[PDB]
Amino acid sequence: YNVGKAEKDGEIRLKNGVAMSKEELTREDKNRLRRALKRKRSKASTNIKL
């Protein structure tokens, strides 16, 4: 068993085992996680006149 992607769409699950529901995450965290996702994928006449 390897902890992988969350089965629920709303949930976010990381390889370390930390799971976060998107509802609870604060907006700054949501952006931070979104940016972290980017890095990992990258490594792998009338109308006119008036």
């Binding site: 907006r27 006449s45 009338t46 006119i48 006149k49 008036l50």
Partner: protein
């Protein structure tokens, strides 16, 4: 080159902001884009104008459009005015000194609401960025931020230092605890956006997008973990549009309360709060009516709850205005009458007086007592002009024509006209001619202050452009009817001379200064030049992708400029019609271009709210003028070239006049600080029988532990080797003190073990040599507790592995197939067993 700076700005009475009424009908404070105006209601004249400074066009001036005022709040007792700007900047203004006192920058978007506390020492600001920040005026700092809301703050209520209620565009009403900086309660006020919030005692009212209006009782001291906000009832206002603002006012003599619901339409609906006895009296009467109707007692009580709102609220009166309303505020409350002041979106101020007696008002409609309308134009100015004397500026707008004195900036005369599109002075500065959208030509006389003549059938369609010859005896008008018509001035009346039929709609017509060329722009993207005297075709300029909107010809009749909706300015040679250069000038359509007199330099204005000064020979942008907030529709250049006048969609007319430690080393420092405190307290306690730690708010054990965590493991072993033995005894004392705290020990048990065992192993020889009896006892205490903590984690693991194995085994007996033949079981287990694929070389 010389620099152009904003000499003056006028024509704006009330911009996109709220209005503040101050007692002396009293004065009114309203926003004028980047500046704030103080008006006198009775006289209708501007008392003063607040400008921070740094006029547009200066070298020190910024390269972006000014941030307009968005919300105004004044504290009456202290004569302080707080002005919020669309960039999230709060400026505190001194009304007496008319100067800026404080400048707060904490918001990332437009400020939606400001509010002084009762004592006037703290300012709460809400912004479109969904944050509420409390500012300390005396400290000139931000105390704390409130960051629960997920959309723009529409309204909030805080009359006490202890509690605050906020409303936001996400549909939530949130109760805040100012001493804890946390949100305590959250309710969905409305299905969509929640816009209005007004609180009077326990009574609370909020407005959503629809006509539904909710009532809430505010039992602040409920302290049940819930119910500080509970829904009372729903009452429907007549206006189906959203409610923007709600405000209470109380009559001191009669303790009666009134409030309004400013709608997005042209309606303000006022309401009266029924007194408690009247609620009781009404309740009995309705119960008798319902009882007479034969309804059961249970049904009556439920209906009374359904009709709860009607008992408290009485629709008082509805104020109807010709123009959409932008903001409103109570002015005075009295038994005789009730007065309101509002600002419309069409740049005017209206004062309403409501005389009333007892329940209902005396008049069917409110009385409009005062209006401030002379110094502005209701609709946007489509065309402007400057007289030859450079003293009178004619501004033509939909429904009205106004003339201004450039020196006093005050409107002299106002004329009622059609949807004016083009306006120009006749020679002498005593007459004006308009080209209306209905195809009419209107001639006004300034001295007579009346319209002399109208030519109803001048054109079949809109008259887009209108120009005069240098002599001023001939008139040229270009219209959407696909014709150009020549007119003569004969004593004064206009006579049609000739008609030139073209193939497509005409957008602009220009006559060269010397009266030789006539340039006409067509909707098929082409500019046609004709010889004025003979009307013989001369050239057909081509290459513009979108229709040409303005044309202008140099004073020497050598160059012709064409600015089109394709964002390009093209400069041509009239001798051969060759294009000298195409400039990608603006970020949107360019509406007007004008040559400076006696020079080839020209100005350009576009929908991007930027006026640009160009050089005619070098074809570079000399200066960028950022002062307008919206589209610039028209432009005009003085005959002498001393100043340029621009009129924009924001109802503003602007005149431009020509002028370190490493790991281990950090750990040793941490040990010194923590163990200095631990040893100090231990000595103090024995006898009885620092700044850094206080700042971080951590115990000595936690402070050292955190330093250990921060050290990267790849550096930890080398960090501990650098430590002297004297610090190792300090480290051992730290581990001893951690042992008493069982919470910390089990939080970081593996880390403690790795560092402790490494320390002992590295310098075991020196540790054993020491004959300190105290040290022997520490290692005994450290040893026993480390085992028990490790054993406790050890026993829990062993219990679970054996228990979970039992659970697996029981399921196998009940729900696993067994094959008596051993060979048949082998293949079954192989198939059921998990399979993983590995790459092999």
């Amino acid at each position: 080159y010389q620099r152009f700076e904003q000499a003056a700005a006028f024509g704006v009475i009330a911009s996109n902001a709220n209005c503040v009424w101050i007692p002396a009908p009293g004065q009114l404070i309203t926003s004028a884009l980047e500046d704030v105006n103080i008006w006198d209601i009775k006289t209708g004249d501007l008392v003063s104008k607040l400008s921070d400074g740094l006029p547009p066009g200066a070298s020190d001036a910024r390269g972006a459009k000014p941030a307009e005022c968005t919300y105004l709040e004044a504290h009456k007792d202290t004569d302080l005015l707080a002005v919020g700007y669309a960039d999230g900047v709060i400026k505190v203004w001194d009304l007496m000194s008319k100067t800026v006192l404080l400048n707060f920058n904490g918001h990332k978007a437009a400020i939606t609401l400001l509010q002084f506390d009762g004592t006037g020492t703290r300012l709460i600001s809400g912004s479109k960025d969904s944050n509420i920040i409390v500012w300390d005026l005396v400290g000139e700092v931000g105390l704390y931020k409130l960051r629960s809301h997920k959309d723009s703050i529409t309204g909030f209520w805080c009359q006490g230092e202890d509690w605050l209620i906020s409303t936001s565009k996400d549909g939530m009403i949130k109760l805040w605890d100012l001493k804890t900086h946390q949100c305590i309660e959250t309710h969905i006020a409305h299905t969509g956006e929640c816009w209005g919030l007004a609180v009077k005692d326990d009574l609370l009212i909020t407005t959503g997008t629809d006509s539904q209006v909710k009532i809430w009782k505010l039992d602040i001291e409920n302290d049940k973990m819930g119910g500080k906000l509970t829904e009372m009832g729903i009452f429907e206002k007549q206006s189906k549009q959203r409610g923007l603002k709600i405000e209470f006012i109380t009559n001191s003599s009669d303790k009666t309360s009134f409030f309004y619901i400013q709608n997005a339409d042209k309606t303000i609906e006022t309401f009266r709060i029924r007194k408690e006895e009247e609620i009781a009296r009404g309740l009995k009467k309705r119960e008798k009516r319902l009882k007479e109707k034969g309804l059961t007692e249970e049904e009556i009580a439920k209906s009374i709850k359904e009709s709860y709102s009607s008992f408290i609220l009485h629709p008082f009166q509805t104020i109807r205005s010709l123009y959409k309303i932008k903001s409103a505020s109570w002015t005075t409350v009295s038994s005789s009458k009730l007065e309101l002041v509002l600002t419309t979106s069409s740049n005017t101020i209206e004062y309403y007086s409501i005389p009333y007696e007892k329940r209902d008002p005396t008049s069917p409609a409110p009385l409009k007592t005062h209006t401030i309308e002379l110094q502005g134009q209701r609709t946007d100015v489509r065309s402007i002009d400057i007289s030859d004397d450079n003293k009178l500026l004619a501004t033509a707008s939909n429904g009205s024509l106004k003339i201004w004195n450039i020196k006093t900036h005050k409107c002299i005369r106002t004329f009622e006209c059609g949807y004016a599109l083009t306006c120009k002075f006749l020679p002498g500065g005593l007459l004006v001619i308009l080209g209306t959208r209905n195809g009419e030509l209107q001639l006004f006389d300034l001295a007579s202050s009346s319209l002399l003549d109208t030519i109803e059938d001048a054109h079949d369609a809109a008259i887009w452009s209108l120009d005069l010859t240098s002599d001023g005896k001939r008139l040229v008008t270009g219209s959407a009817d696909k014709t150009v018509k020549f007119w003569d001035f004969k004593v004064l009346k206009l006579h049609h001379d000739t008609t030139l039929e073209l193939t497509d709609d005409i957008l602009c017509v220009r006559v060269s200064p010397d009266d030789r060329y006539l340039a006409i722009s067509l909707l098929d993207n082409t500019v046609k030049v004709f010889f004025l005297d003979s009307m013989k075709f001369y050239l057909s300029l081509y290459g513009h992708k979108l229709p040409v909107l303005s044309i202008d010809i140099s004073f020497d009749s050598k160059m012709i400029i064409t600015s089109s909706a394709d964002k390009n300015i093209k400069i041509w040679g009239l001798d051969f019609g060759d294009c000298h250069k195409s400039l990608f000038a603006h970020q949107d359509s360019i509406m007007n271009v004008k040559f400076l007199p006696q020079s080839h330099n020209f100005f350009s204005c576009s929908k991007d709210a930027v006026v640009k000064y160009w050089d005619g020979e070098k074809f570079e942008c000399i200066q960028k003028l950022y002062a307008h907030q919206s589209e610039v529709w028209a432009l005009a250049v003085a005959t002498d070239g001393g100043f340029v006048v621009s009129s924009s969609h924001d109802h503003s007319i602007r005149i431009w006049e020509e002028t370190s430690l490493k790991a281990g080393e950090r750990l040793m420092e941490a040990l010194d600080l923590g163990i200095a405190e631990i040893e100090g307290l231990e000595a103090y306690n024995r006898d009885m029988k620092n700044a850094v730690l206080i700042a971080v708010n951590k115990t000595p054990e936690q402070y050292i532990m955190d330093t250990l965590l921060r050290i990267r493991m790849s550096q930890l072993e080398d960090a501990l080797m650098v430590m002297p033995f004297s610090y190792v005894l300090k480290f051992l004392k730290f581990i001893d003190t951690v042992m008493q705290n069982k919470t910390l020990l089990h939080s970081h048990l593996p880390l403690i073990c790795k560092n402790l065992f490494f320390i002992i192993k590295f310098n075991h020889k020196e540790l054993v040599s020491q004959k300190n009896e105290e040290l022997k006892l520490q290692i005994n205490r450290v040893k026993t507790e480390l085992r028990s903590a490790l054993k406790s984690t050890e026993d829990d693991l062993g219990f679970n592995v054996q228990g979970l194995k039992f659970v697996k085994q029981q399921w196998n007996l009940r729900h696993n197939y067994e094959f008596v033949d051993e060979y048949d079981q082998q293949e079954k287990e192989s198939n059921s067993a998990r399979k993983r694929v590995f790459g092999t070389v």
